[PDB]
Design a protein around this ligand. Structure first.
Ligand SMILES: *[C@@H]1O[C@H](CO)[C@@H](O)[C@H](O)[C@H]1NC(C)=O
Ligand SMILES: *[C@@H]1O[C@H](CO)[C@@H](O)[C@H](O)[C@H]1NC(C)=O
Lengths: 48, 58
């Protein structure tokens, strides 16, 4: 459990290795109910 | 000249990922089945953004 602040967004949660395939230009995920779901790490090209 | 913009002019309004979702968003878009000016170097206005398209062979 970490309090995290990615490029422009901030939150609290656990970051885990993902299973999704973000596009090269996509940064922040979003669930159906307008909630942040996944992020692109600014340095490592891995989706969390 | 004029032409029909059938269903063109849709652009990702942000850098946000969404899967299997129907999202409602309001912004500047090209209205469906509207008039688009067709040219064969005139100066044009830039009121609130411009969609530009080109067919090229050379
Ligand atoms: C950012 O820098 C690190 C080392 O400081 C490097 O390993 C990484 O590949 C770099 N990322 C990009 C996208 O250049
Ligand atoms: C395009 O222009 C013609 C006449 O120039 C007009 O009859 C037509 O309604 C226009 N298209 C739209 C979608 O308004």
């Amino acid at each position: 459990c970490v309090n995290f602040n990615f490029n422009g967004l901030t939150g609290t949660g656990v970051l885990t290795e993902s299973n999704k395939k973000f596009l090269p230009f996509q940064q922040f995920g979003r669930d159906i109910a307008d909630t942040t779901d996944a992020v692109r790490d600014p340095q490592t090209l891995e989706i969390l | 000249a004029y032409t029909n913009s059938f269903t063109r002019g849709v652009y990702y309004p942000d850098k946000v990922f969404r899967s299997s979702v129907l999202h409602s968003t309001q912004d500047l878009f090209l209205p469906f089945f509207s008039n688009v000016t067709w040219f064969h170097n005139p100066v044009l206005p830039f009121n609130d953004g411009v969609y530009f398209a080109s067919t090229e062979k050379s």
